Structure formats: structure tokens, C-alpha cells
Paper text:
To characterize the binding modes of the fragments studied, they were soaked in NS5B crystals to obtain the protein complex X-ray structures. Inspection of the crystal structures indicated that fragments 114, 204, 117, and 328 all bound at the palm I allosteric domain, while fragment 162 bound at the thumb region. Fragment 162 binds NS5B in a small cavity of the thumb pocket, with its trifluoromethyl moiety extending a key hydrogen bond with Asn369 as well as making hydrophobic interactions with Ser371 and Glu481. To our knowledge, the three residues constitute a new active domain in the thumb region never disclosed before. A prominent feature for another 3 hits was the presence of a trifluoromethyl group which is responsible for key interactions with active domains as discussed later.
Residue numbers in the entry: 1 to 22, 28 to 148, 154 to 539, 548 to 562
Write the structure that this text describes.
């Protein structure tokens, strides 16, 4: 069928939509835009097409292996109270007279409605369920992306999803997919694993695979298979019925309704704004790729899967033979309805492969020992940082990136300096800030950063020092390209900040001592002083 059909009703905004900055971070403010509903139509054209899916024996076999491992999982139902507590404070309200605030408080109005939505789930396993459709507001840098489409059901339903499936999507994928399951790794854990699986090959070859608009490529069959997998778990019988209902009424598809309550059409592919999205896309990606590997006689594959994002490291068969078996791999994925965006390409250097928007690089600690860490082209981070510092926003990408990319050259020299300067200037150091990690919302105290980083990256994070020439040129370039002060200018700014922080004692002094030792010249000695990287949840409406 078609991924979507349209009525012609517009995808409409809920509120005013900014698309540009209203400046000591970056000069070329021209280059930063936010996406808006103004670009919905273009995206609309890209995500809508027919899906032809041909299975084969490798598909059927990998699924059989997955269903066998899923049968070792036992999963419990979540009480209303637990499901309510997982709902973010600012999650979109219900069209039935209550908001997340009422949900979090166990207001008897929200809970009663939630009871009725659940009851109706058990009784009716057919009637499609209403979804809202929305263009996202996401900041990027020039050289333009159409806004992504987000699709999500009413708050009431979302809470039922949690009850029915939070335990499953938190617990199953790991067991089903073992070490391929990306969201069980912190960044140092992910580097360590990529690097070890690369050293483990006699003659290694790697390649990422970009599936073109993955959410569209997911078929209604795919979503029933995925259900068939959940069902292999030892479930409560009420969980079993709600899961059949949710999938048949919502996951499989349904009507799309814009912010003004008009009907935009009907979806027959993955909704992005549901609980099963990450888990769904990760299982569906692992299954197709694991099978595509077999079709292409790829020798000795290890995979890493994070939703629609896929890395494969295997034994090379020769550079010709490689290029070729990769084309077969692609044919297989295409048959399975996951055709390519960029066409995939072999790499014989781990450092050259990008996955989850990231790549492995290396530097050196105090002792000169070499250290691998995860980094990325810092353009979108800096872009969003400029946005976040200009317009006030609920989301703080900067902090997320400081946490994820603490070891990187750019996060230490630029993000850390910049934002500790603002916080010191605003006397807002003590305040918790919300940020996204593998799609879940965590409240974090910026002064905790040092221990957080020590815990997730090791102490070497505070003293890495001979960054690769490629990495240094990527940063410098991005700075010039963007109009951000070169790295030497941050060094001077950091000494100033480090100093102010040191003067305040307590945890600020630790922030200054640790975060900015790289900037001093004569170094201080840096001695020693989380259920966060377990599962993926973007679009799952989760808070911890
Ligand atoms: N040519 C490059 C480009 C980037 C990198 C690193 F930053 F990822 F290390 C290495 N070599």
C-alpha cells in the first residue's frame, strides 16, 4: 500500500513558528534556520510512496532466531501510577479535559479517563485511533531540510502504551539483539565495542547504511511481525490484548488530524510519536540487515543498530569483492522495503565510518597512552547552541552534547566555556535543566557535570591532548564556515571562566578545576571524586 494518503488539508502549526535567530558564539547568523510547517509539503512529497516487499528464506530464519530469544523474556504490566510518573511535565495535553500535570498528580479525572481508554482497548481491537500530525521545529545549519513529520496519539492512549509496553520495549530488544542493540551503550561503551569488534577481525571492513525515510519503509506487515515478536514474551493476558489492540488500531496505521482538527489523511507506516517507535525500528532494522548480510554472503558480520541507524563490521573478502557484496546487501534491503538514501560504501578505517551521527577518533591522556572517544562534525551542535542561547527554550541540546561528547575538542573548548560563562553571568549555575538522552527526558544539575563525565568517560576526559589532524581541521573548518571565534580565542575565554569558577568554591571550583584544566598551562593533578544508557525512546513521551 501507500505509506500515506493526503486529503489536501495542510499540516498546520500550533503556535508562532520562528525560523531564524533573533551572537558572540557565531557571526554568520544567516546560516542557522529552524524548520517550519511552511516546508511540510516538500517532506510530504518525500515520505509518500508505494511499498513492495518480497521476503526470502534468510528473512524467515532470522525472524525465527529472534522469536526464540524473545521467548525468554517475561514482562509485567505497569500500574497507572507508574505510567503516570513516566509522563513528561510538559507533554501535550489531552483533548479530554486534562494535561500531563493532572496525569502526574493522579487526578481522578485523568486516571478515570485513562481507565476507560484501556477498557476500550480490550473491547475494541479494530477501530483505528486518532493521531495528530505536526511539523517539527528543528535547528540546522545551511548546506535546506524540510521539517520532519511527527505523528502521535492523545495523552490518554500514550499512558496506556506505557502500561502495556514500557516493560517490553525496555527489556526485550537487548535480549533479542544482544550486543547489536545500540541503546545499551554509553558513548565510551559504544566506542569500546566498535573498536573491539574492529580489532577482532583478521582483515576488517565496515559500512554504515542509510535507509531512505525509514519510517515510510516500515510496512504494516513489519508492524505485525514486531507484534508477533512482543507476543513471544511471557505476558499478562490483559497486556496481550492491549498490545494486539494498540498495534491493530494505532501502530499499523490510522487517520492523521492537523492541529485545527481537520483530517489530513491516513497513515499505513510507522508513526514517529509512539512508544514502540525506537524498539520497532531497531528490531525491524536488525532483522532486515541481519538477513541482508546473509543474502550478500557477508563473512562474519557484527552489527550495531540504533533505530533506523545501522553499522556493519565484517571480514573483508577483497576490495572488489567487498564493493560487490555491498551492492547485493543493498538489493536485499530494497527487496525488504528498506532502500538506500546515500548508497552505502566500504571503509577500511573505523574512523571514517559515521553512525548515530558519530565517529570514533583517538587522542592521548596525561601519560601519552592512546584513547578512543566518540565525536562528530560539530555543526548542528554549535547551530543549536547559538539558537538555545538566543531564544529561551525548554530543550537544552548543548548540555546533552556536553555529556555525550565531553571528551571532544569542541565540547570542551567551546560548549563548556560558552555556557559556563552564561551561567556565571546569569547566576543560574544551581538550576536543573532538562535534556534528551536516547530520547528520554532527564533533569540535570550542570554542577554535577564533572562526576557525570568521570562516571561516563573516565578521568581521561579531562586531559585528552593530541587530537587527530582530521578532527582538528573539521573543527577549525566548521568554525570558519560558521563564523565562530577560532579555538585560540576560546582558550583565553576559558581561563577567565575557570578562574571565576575556582573563586566560588564548592562544586563550581570543581567545575573550574576539572572542565578547564586543558586551558591552564601548568596542570593541576586530577584525582577521582546512572540508569541512563539502557534503552532508546525518542517519540516515546518518556521522562525519568
Ligand atoms: N579525515 C578524518 C576526518 C575526521 C577524523 C576524526 F575526527 F573522526 F578523527 C579523522 N580523519
Amino acid at each position: 500500500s501507500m505509506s500515506y494518503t493526503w486529503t489536501g488539508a495542510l499540516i498546520t502549526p500550533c503556535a508562532a513558528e520562528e525560523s531564524k535567530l533573533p551572537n558572540s558564539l557565531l557571526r554568520h547568523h544567516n546560516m542557522v534556520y529552524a524548520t517550519t510547517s511552511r516546508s511540510a509539503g516538500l517532506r510530504q512529497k518525500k515520505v509518500t510512496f508505494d511499498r513492495l516487499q518480497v521476503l526470502d528464506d534468510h528473512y524467515r530464519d532470522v525472524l525465527k532466531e529472534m522469536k526464540a530469544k524473545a521467548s525468554t523474556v517475561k514482562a509485567k504490566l505497569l500500574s497507572v501510577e507508574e505510567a503516570c510518573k513516566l509522563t513528561p511535565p510538559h507533554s501535550a495535553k489531552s483533548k479530554f479535559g486534562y494535561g500531563a500535570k493532572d496525569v502526574r498528580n493522579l487526578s481522578s479525572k485523568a486516571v478515570n479517563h485513562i481507565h476507560s481508554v484501556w477498557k476500550d482497548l480490550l473491547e475494541d481491537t479494530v477501530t483505528p485511533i486518532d493521531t495528530t500530525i505536526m511539523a517539527k521545529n528543528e535547528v540546522f545549519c545551511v548546506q535546506r531540510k524540510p521539517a520532519r513529520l511527527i505523528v502521535f496519539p492523545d495523552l490518554g492512549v500514550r499512558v496506556c502504551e506505557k502500561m502495556a509496553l514500557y516493560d517490553v520495549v525496555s527489556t526485550l530488544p537487548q535480549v533479542v539483539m544482544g550486543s547489536s542493540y545500540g541503546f545499551q551503550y554509553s558513548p565510551g561503551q559504544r566506542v569500546e565495542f566498535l573498536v573491539n569488534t574492529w580489532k577482532s577481525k583478521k582483515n576488517p571492513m565496515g559500512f554504515s547504511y542509510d535507509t531512505r525515510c525509514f519510517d515510510s519503509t516500515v510496512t504494516e506487515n513489519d508492524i505485525r511481525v514486531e507484534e508477533s515478536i512482543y507476543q513471544c514474551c511471557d505476558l499478562a493476558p490483559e497486556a496481550r490484548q492491549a498490545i494486539k489492540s494498540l498495534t491493530e488500531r494505532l501502530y499499523i496505521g490510522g487517520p492523521l488530524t492537523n492541529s485545527k482538527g481537520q483530517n489530513c489523511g491516513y497513515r499505513r507506516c510507522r508513526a514517529s510519536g509512539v512508544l514502540t517507535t525506537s524498539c520497532g525500528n531497531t528490531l525491524t532494522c536488525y532483522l532486515k540487515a541481519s538477513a541482508a548480510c546473509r543474502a550478500a554472503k557477508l563473512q562474519d558480520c557484527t552489527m550495531l543498530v540504533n533505530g533506523d541507524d545501522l553499522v556493519v563490521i565484517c571480514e573483508s573478502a577483497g576490495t572488489q569483492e567487498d564493493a560487490a557484496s555491498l551492492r547485493v546487501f543493498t538489493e536485499a534491503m530494497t527487496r525488504y522495503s528498506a532502500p538506500p538514501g546515500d548508497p552505502p560504501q566500504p571503509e577500511y578505517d573505523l574512523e571514517l565510518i559515521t553512525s548515530c551521527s558519530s565517529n570514533v577518533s583517538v587522542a592521548h591522556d596525561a601519560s601519552g597512552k592512546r584513547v578512543y572517544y566518540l565525536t562528530r562534525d560539530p555543526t548542528t551542535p554549535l547551530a543549536r547552541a547559538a539558537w538555545e542561547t538566543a531564544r529561551h527554550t525548554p530543550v537544552n541540546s548543548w548540555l546533552g552534547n556536553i555529556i555525550m561528547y565531553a571528551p571532544t575538542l569542541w565540547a570542551r573548548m567551546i560548549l563548556m566555556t560558552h555556557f559556563f560563562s552564561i551561567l556565571l553571568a546569569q547566576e543560574q549555575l544551581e538550576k536543573a535543566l532538562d535534556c534528551q538522552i536516547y530520547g528520554a527526558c532527564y533533569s540535570i544539575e550542570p554542577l554535577d557535570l564533572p562526576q557525570i563525565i568521570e562516571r561516563l568517560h573516565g578521568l581521561s576526559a579531562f586531559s585528552l591532548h593530541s587530537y587527530s589532524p582530521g578532527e582538528i581541521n573539521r573543527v577549525a573548518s566548521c568554525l570558519r564556515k560558521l563564523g565562530v571565534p577560532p579555538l585560540r580565542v576560546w582558550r583565553h575565554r576559558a581561563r577567565s571562566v575557570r578562574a571565576r569558577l575556582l573563586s566560588q568554591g564548592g562544586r563550581a571550583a570543581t567545575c573550574g578545576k576539572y572542565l578547564f584544566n586543558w586551558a591552564v598551562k601548568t596542570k593541576l593533578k586530577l584525582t577521582p571524586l546512572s540508569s541512563m544508557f539502557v534503552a532508546g525512546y525518542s517519540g516515546g513521551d518518556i521522562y525519568h
